[PDB]
Design a protein around this ligand. Structure first.
Ligand code: T7S
Ligand code: T7S
Lengths: 304, 304
């Protein structure tokens, strides 16, 4: 028993972190096979900043301007290309610690672990969600750019995120490993405001299931609801609309706990309309929305 | 910016996790040099359970009854001894991945990362505190015993915790790596109730500092207080008494933010007396107490 916000073991990804220095800029790169991936803004300076023309900036860069260091050993850069907002530095040595890996573009509501790094050295690991507004609520200081977000399926790391941008509101933006930003965000120091940070309804329900499974049951009530009725209450409270797909996704948790999804929706509805009344659910005073149904099943079953 | 509940990178510790099987019991061991550490209850059965005499139970065990498996390779057990509530299995091979390590007995309020494992395979990593009642609020299913809690100081892992017991209230108990339980707890299926789960006052303050440092400032007020006045309010709310040592420990954070510790105490006092009024601090609706002052400094500075 016990339910905890749990990151994947970072080992496989620690073995992929290098330092990338271009000029006076130092940040993090991912080393997979003979390619190192980093944010293209590594090449930026004091001024370019507001409106860097990355293609033009890059013309002034050679292979030898990209200093790539794996612990205390330098990697030889034998090629460099720009793919969207990431650089791909070809090194002459394949990372011997390259795990099985995929690059996946996650959807909003999907969760992942982030290995926070500075100078290609891992500092910590935490669990995130891609927010419905395509931000993430991270922990990222200067030098943390190139830190990646990932999922592990047993021995295969699925990289979903590279850190690029802090918004003036102190939320975070970045790319998949093809260098495409999540959401409308750009690697440019400009007026970028996040949209509404909506709650991931399906995740709150998953977490309501995890709670029951671990003995926290006070919020179970006698009520049920429909999708349409529940979604009126979701709207008012800036919750993602709940779809039959979401109900379907909660099936297993429904099954195991013998609580119908729509009954749990009615439990969530009362929590929204009435608050927690100073009580807690799995040691939280608000409705957690960064556990997927998959995350709950994983942690409640004990998958490795 | 952003502040997140952050575990240490698990890599160094993943490389230390093996499976220990005695009879039909499978749980986790720590492999450091040529010794594997596991809970002594690995040798327990259906009945012993309520009052196992571990010395007597162990007489019926030989080296060859302890099956130790590192991934898909078996380790040869060449000796076994009981140290308090852990077993130390001598293997014929030193773990090639043994990091620099220490065994440290932590104090209540001290935080650590736990690598949740099943069958010597890491499932996840989360951050814990040793509670003032010597419990931890973990996530531990069957097979998770022998999972360890640790801190890293750069390249040196300080192991502080091995998982042994779930209390009927679904909180967790275990030992340091010398096999001594934190608190009054025993590896025996009996009436063990946790005492009052008090809040780690110094940690809440550290976290109040982390908040200010990351822009969450609404709870700053015009008030100050004394230790004695603040401690009357702490008592009433089951908070650890705050000592000058704690004030001293918060010095650096005081310095950096230019908020006197006693002013922040007065901020915490009003939060206790008035609640959050439906507001949040670093995306929490209650007062987080599993960040040390050291943890705040680390994450706010970016130590690796
Ligand atoms: C997120 C990260 O690590 N970054 C690298 C540093 C960079 C920065 O601070 N500057 C200032 C000096 C000129 C380049 C940009 C911000 C992004
Ligand atoms: C915490 C852990 O992993 N443990 C190992 C399993 C054990 C258990 O379930 N049993 C039942 C069968 C007889 C031995 C005890 C509990 C501790």
């Amino acid at each position: 028993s016990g339910f905890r916000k749990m990151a994947f073991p970072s080992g496989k990804v620690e073995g992929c972190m290098v330092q990338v220095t271009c000029g006076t800029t130092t940040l993090n790169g991912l080393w997979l096979d003979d390619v190192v991936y980093c944010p293209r803004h590594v090449i930026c300076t004091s001024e370019d900043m507001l409106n860097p023309n990355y293609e033009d900036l890059l013309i002034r860069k050679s292979n030898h301007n990209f200093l790539v260091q794996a612990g205390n050993v330098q990697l030889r850069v034998i090629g460099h290309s720009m793919q969207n907002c990431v650089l791909k530095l070809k090194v002459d040595t394949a990372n011997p610690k390259t795990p099985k890996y995929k690059f996946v573009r996650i959807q909003p509501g999907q969760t992942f672990s982030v290995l926070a790094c500075y100078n290609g050295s891992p500092s910590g690991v935490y669990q995130c969600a891609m927010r419905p507004n395509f931000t993430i609520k991270g922990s990222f200081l200067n030098g943390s750019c190139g830190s990646v977000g990932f999922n592990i399926d047993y021995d295969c790391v699925s990289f979903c995120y590279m850190h690029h941008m802090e918004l003036p509101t102190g939320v975070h933006a970045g790319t998949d490993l093809e260098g495409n930003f999540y959401g409308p965000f750009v690697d440019r120091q400009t007026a970028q405001a996040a949209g509404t940070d909506t709650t991931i309804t399906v995740n709150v329900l998953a977490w309501l299931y995890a709670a029951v499974i671990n003995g926290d049951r006070w919020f179970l009530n006698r009520f049920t609801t429909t999708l349409n009725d529940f979604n009126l209450v979701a709207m008012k409270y800036n919750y993602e609309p709940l779809t039959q797909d979401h109900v379907d996704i909660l099936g297993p948790l429904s099954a195991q706990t013998g609580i119908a999804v729509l009954d749990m929706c009615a439990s969530l509805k009362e929590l929204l309309q009435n608050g927690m009344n100073g009580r807690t659910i799995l040691g939280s005073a608000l409705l957690e929305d960064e556990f997927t149904p998959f995350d709950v099943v994983r942690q409640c079953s004990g998958v490795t």
